[PDB]
Amino acid sequence: KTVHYLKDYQTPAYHILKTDLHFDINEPQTVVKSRLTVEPQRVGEPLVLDGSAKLLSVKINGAAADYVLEGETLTIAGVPSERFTVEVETEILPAENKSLMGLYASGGNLFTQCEPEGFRKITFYIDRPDVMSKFTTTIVADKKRYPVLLSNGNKIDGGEFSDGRHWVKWEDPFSKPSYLFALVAGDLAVTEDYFTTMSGRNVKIEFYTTEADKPKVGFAVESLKNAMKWDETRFGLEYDLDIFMVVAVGDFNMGAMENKGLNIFNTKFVLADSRTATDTDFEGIESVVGHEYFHNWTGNRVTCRDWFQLSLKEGLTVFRDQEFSGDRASRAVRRIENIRLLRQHQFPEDAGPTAHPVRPASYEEMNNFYTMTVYEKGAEVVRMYHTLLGEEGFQKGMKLYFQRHDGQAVTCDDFRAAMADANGINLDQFALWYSQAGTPVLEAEGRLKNNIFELTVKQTVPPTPDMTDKQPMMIPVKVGLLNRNGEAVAFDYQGKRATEAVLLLTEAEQTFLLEGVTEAVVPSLLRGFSAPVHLNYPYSDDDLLLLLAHDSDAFTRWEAAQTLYRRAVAANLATLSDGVELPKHEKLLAAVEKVISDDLLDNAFKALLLGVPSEAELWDGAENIDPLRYHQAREALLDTLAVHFLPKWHELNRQAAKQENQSYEYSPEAAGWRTLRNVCRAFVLRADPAHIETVAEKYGEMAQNMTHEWGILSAVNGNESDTRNRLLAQFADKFSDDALVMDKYFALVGSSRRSDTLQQVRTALQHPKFSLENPNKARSLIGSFSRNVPHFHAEDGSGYRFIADKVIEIDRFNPQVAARLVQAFNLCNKLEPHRKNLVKQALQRIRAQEGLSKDVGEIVGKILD
Numbered sequence: 001k002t003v004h005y006l007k008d009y010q011t012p013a014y015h016i017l018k019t020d021l022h023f024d025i026n027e028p029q030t031v032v033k034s035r036l037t038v039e040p041q042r043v044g045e046p047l048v049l050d051g052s053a054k055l056l057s058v059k060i061n062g063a064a065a066d067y068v069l070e071g072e073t074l075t076i077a078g079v080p081s082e083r084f085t086v087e088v089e090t091e092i093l094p095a096e097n098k099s100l101m102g103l104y105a106s107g108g109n110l111f112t113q114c115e116p117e118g119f120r121k122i123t124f125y126i127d128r129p130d131v132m133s134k135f136t137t138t139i140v141a142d143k144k145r146y147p148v149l150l151s152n153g154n155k156i157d158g159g160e161f162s163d164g165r166h167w168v169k170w171e172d173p174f175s176k177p178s179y180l181f182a183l184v185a186g187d188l189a190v191t192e193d194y195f196t197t198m199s200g201r202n203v204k205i206e207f208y209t210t211e212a213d214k215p216k217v218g219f220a221v222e223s224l225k226n227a228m229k230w231d232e233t234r235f236g237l238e239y240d241l242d243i244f245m246v247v248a249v250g251d252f253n254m255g256a257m258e259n260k261g262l263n264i265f266n267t268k269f270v271l272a273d274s275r276t277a278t279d280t281d282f283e284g285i286e287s288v289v290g291h292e293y294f295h296n297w298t299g300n301r302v303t304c305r306d307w308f309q310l311s312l313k314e315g316l317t318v319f320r321d322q323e324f325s326g327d328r329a330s331r332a333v334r335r336i337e338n339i340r341l342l343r344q345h346q347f348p349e350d351a352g353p354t355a356h357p358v359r360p361a362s363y364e365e366m367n368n369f370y371t372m373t374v375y376e377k378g379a380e381v382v383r384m385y386h387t388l389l390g391e392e393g394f395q396k397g398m399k400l401y402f403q404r405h406d407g408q409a410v411t412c413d414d415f416r417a418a419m420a421d422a423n424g425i426n427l428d429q430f431a432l433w434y435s436q437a438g439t440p441v442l443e444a445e446g447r448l449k450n451n452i453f454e455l456t457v458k459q460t461v462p463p464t465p466d467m468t469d470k471q472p473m474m475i476p477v478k479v480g481l482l483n484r485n486g487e488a489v490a491f492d493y494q495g496k497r498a499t500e501a502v503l504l505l506t507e508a509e510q511t512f513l514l515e516g517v518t519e520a521v522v523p524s525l526l527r528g529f530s531a532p533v534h535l536n537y538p539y540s541d542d543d544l545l546l547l548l549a550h551d552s553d554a555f556t557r558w559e560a561a562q563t564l565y566r567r568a569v570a571a572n573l574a575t576l577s578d579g580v581e582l583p584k585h586e587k588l589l590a591a592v593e594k595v596i597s598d599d600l601l602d603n604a605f606k607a608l609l610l611g612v613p614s615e616a617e618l619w620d621g622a623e624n625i626d627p628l629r630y631h632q633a634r635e636a637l638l639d640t641l642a643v644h645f646l647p648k649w650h651e652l653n654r655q656a657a658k659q660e661n662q663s664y665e666y667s668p669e670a671a672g673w674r675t676l677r678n679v680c681r682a683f684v685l686r687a688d689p690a691h692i693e694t695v696a697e698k699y700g701e702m703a704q705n706m707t708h709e710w711g712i713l714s715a716v717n718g719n720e721s722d723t724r725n726r727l728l729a730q731f732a733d734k735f736s737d738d739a740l741v742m743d744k745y746f747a748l749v750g751s752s753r754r755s756d757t758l759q760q761v762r763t764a765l766q767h768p769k770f771s772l773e774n775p776n777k778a779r780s781l782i783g784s785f786s787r788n789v790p791h792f793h794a795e796d797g798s799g800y801r802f803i804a805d806k807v808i809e810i811d812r813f814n815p816q817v818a819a820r821l822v823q824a825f826n827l828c829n830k831l832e833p834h835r836k837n838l839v840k841q842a843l844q845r846i847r848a849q850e851g852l853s854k855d856v857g858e859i860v861g862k863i864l865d
């Protein structure tokens, strides 16, 4: 089996200077012709082209080449010593392409997806990101069937042919890697707008959607204009073409793609209106539209040397999107949401069998590395430069990065060196953030003696499958101090008297001396989640109530609440285990009452403070896990909270209905009241399931936007009443024509805690609006089921067998989706023996499939072997 290793990187033997492409689209076949201008770098080496499309011909300077094709590689030994041309002709059947990588059909239109290695599914090429070329693309198609013909860059020519056909030619003058190629052909509607760059140049903006979907694109257009302006104001970065196209597609393996000047978006990240999309959905559009635009500099103008460097573009662009969203509105709440995501989804990755560094040292299938570690831990790593350097220093690094590397394909090391060099500091130890996997664990203890608060901190990083030796890392720990009434206490550190400091841990163990401390203190630690680590410090439950009630930092208050909930769940696990009554949780209930009643808290922040960690967070670090015991303990906690405060959940609901004030459109202010209301709805229906019939009676009146419809449906989704099934059927009927709302229906089907979810899911497979071949549908139904703790982890193994069967089926046509799904089994080694045995059986059955993809094989191997 082939493994690719970062240590084996070598510059290409050949460059491609110019890439001329011609697409002749017919029914059913598209013929692609290329003309490649090739420049030897290591003269005399064989020319090796990657490719998997049907090959019709290959020429070297106009003459039939003497070549061999074996597997997905075409090799020509007989090549000239000077510049030469290669012409390839391939044939593609796009409607047969259910992988959604390469050239494929969707909705009767044609789209491409090339990142990372899809271009080689279109033609034979040197399909690696360090080969940058200047592309010109000609497209010829039936004008009635495909009136819209797009590719990267500037449209330089076009015309009509007398048999009903037409053509266009696009020139993209910026040399680029093949992964950023795109082509679209279709009958699509356009929404036009524009932005004027700070140098005074207009940029024509065009969003292409189905005709029916066009009324839902306006928020995405506004978001793009906001993102363009922000990259100018915050980073000094301007767009570089007079045209920026975005195309929505409903069959897409990921959220969006930054193809130069012609971004391609999953509909879920471009279409919204308040009737059909939730506030969270609007927030997502804003994030993703921003993300793809930000890639124009961080990814496109400066690209990746090789795919091991993916985080160079993705960590940095995620950081950029996070900062954009934060600057738009609600920064602290949005930062907590990001940290919560990281801990819920990336920490388990780093603790599991598929753990990898931010910059992996090897891979078998690169599509298995578009992960939370590369993206979200990647962004934390970027954010640490900002914490260490400040905004001004961070911008000095950015400035040198582009000065050095505009137009090049570079590495994570180059980014680090620009930050270091622009600021005149040594960041050599920081490199370990790219090369060492695993979540660092800090053990800290503190002591006020004399007038010094002495904080001792030790760090360790566990072995991961790829590496045992982990050396000490460069870890910024942001700190303050609270007195007995929870106000800030100043202290002295490196000459400055302040109420906050960043303590830079670089050794395995260090002591920090915060001097001049005149009162009894409790430290506030890792403020703003200043490094992506586990911190253990001995806090009493009273210390936690103090932090929650009084700390000035959002993260540390939220962390105090999270810790109180974790301790409460642990207490419930102990009683349920001893067969005794549940704990009183008197102190937790006191703290929650204070939160509910505090009217100075931001409402979205209140909502977060009332969220209990997920089962996966709760069983982090455990062995021999019975997931249903954790689910039982967590549900008992939520039930206690629901019942104990029932009258107050209704009261907060009413206050939020009043403060929303009939403002049903999306805005950040209205959205935070709604977020709060939806937390209250959930608790009300937990305590009083019969309230579902009152809900039903007044549904139409409550259903004023999709945030409310989703909030209600989410709250009743686990209810055993027949009404729950009736409300869901009514939802499916009401929104049957909106594929993105049908995704929500299937997600409710798959996520329900009712006892009958598995057979409802099986029925849903055959719903007329379900398609297994559509990634959004498959993720919503099957994906949700795979994350549905009581059902996926059912003792009988029915959940495991069902998910295994669907990995097997999906893998036949879309290995990417299948390899993401099969990660539901990642907990295997840590499960109690009965479930573990069943998980291993499911994974052996997957392995035993003939023709199993490399994608799924790589993952299964990591879990099993």
Ligand SMILES: NCc1cccc(C[C@H](CP(=O)(O)[C@@H](N)CCc2ccccc2)C(=O)O)c1
Pocket (backbone or CB within 6 Å): 154, 173, 174, 175, 197, 201, 202, 203, 239, 240, 241, 242, 243, 406, 407
């Ligand atoms: N490393 C710099 C570089 C190298 C190679 C190609 C480019 C493309 C760019 C594109 P273009 O010829 O389409 C130019 N006329 C666009 C001007 C413009 C218009 C509107 C908004 C921003 C910029 C140009 O030469 O400015 C840049």
Ligand SMILES: NCc1cccc(C[C@H](CP(=O)(O)[C@@H](N)CCc2ccccc2)C(=O)O)c1
Pocket (backbone or CB within 6 Å): 113, 115, 116, 253, 254, 255, 256, 257, 258, 287, 288, 291, 292, 295, 314, 318, 321, 370
């Ligand atoms: N942090 C804001 C945010 C939230 C959710 C989704 C995204 C876009 C990113 C897509 P991307 O720009 O990184 C793209 N380079 C991924 C490449 C890819 C690979 C395979 C198939 C389709 C697309 C993704 O799908 O995770 C962004």
Ligand SMILES: [Zn+2]
Pocket (backbone or CB within 6 Å): 291, 295, 313, 314, 317
């Ligand atoms: Zn990206």
